[PDB]
Amino acid sequence: KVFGRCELAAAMKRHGLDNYRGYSLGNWVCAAKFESNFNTQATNRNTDGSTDYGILQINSRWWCNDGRTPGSRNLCNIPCSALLSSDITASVNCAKKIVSDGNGMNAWVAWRNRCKGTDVQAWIRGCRL
Ligand SMILES: [Cl-]
Numbered sequence: 613k614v615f616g617r618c619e620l621a622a623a624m625k626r627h628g629l630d631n632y633r634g635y636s637l638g639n640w641v642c643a644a645k646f647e648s649n650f651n652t653q654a655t656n657r658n659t660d661g662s663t664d665y666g667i668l669q670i671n672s673r674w675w676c677n678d679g680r681t682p683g684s685r686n687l688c689n690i691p692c693s694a695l696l697s698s699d700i701t702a703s704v705n706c707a708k709k710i711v712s713d714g715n716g717m718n719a720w721v722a723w724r725n726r727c728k729g730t731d732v733q734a735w736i737r738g739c740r741l
């Protein structure tokens with residue numbers, strides 16, 4: 613699926629991601645545009661043999677199990693495939709472990725390179741609040 617834009621904020625706003633660990637909703641939503649262009653089925657290889665899955669491009673080394681990433685820790689106890697679901701629960705739930713891991717949203721390189729320091733409210737502007 614693909615999401616519209618307000619359309620994700622509300623889910624993201626349901627599942628408890630607004631000011632989750634002080635990150636307002638524009639930060640998540642902004643992460644989801646640039647990680648995946650708003651697409652639950654998104655998958656991209658990384659150079660280390662790992663792959664990133666779904667709306668927030670979560671990673672098979674550390675976070676999920678894809679069976680091809682020799683040393684995976686499956687720190688969300690989960691199959692990486694389950695995170696491509698049109699139901700963002702597993703992604704948002706895993707995303708809430710990651711962000712709580714040390715480095716905050718800097719765990720998402722497109723957040724750092726593209727959201728951080730920018731007025732992340734333009735991403736929730738026009739959403740019915
Ligand atoms: Cl932080």
Ligand code: NA
Pocket residue numbers: 672673674675676677678681683684685686
């Ligand atoms: Na893994």
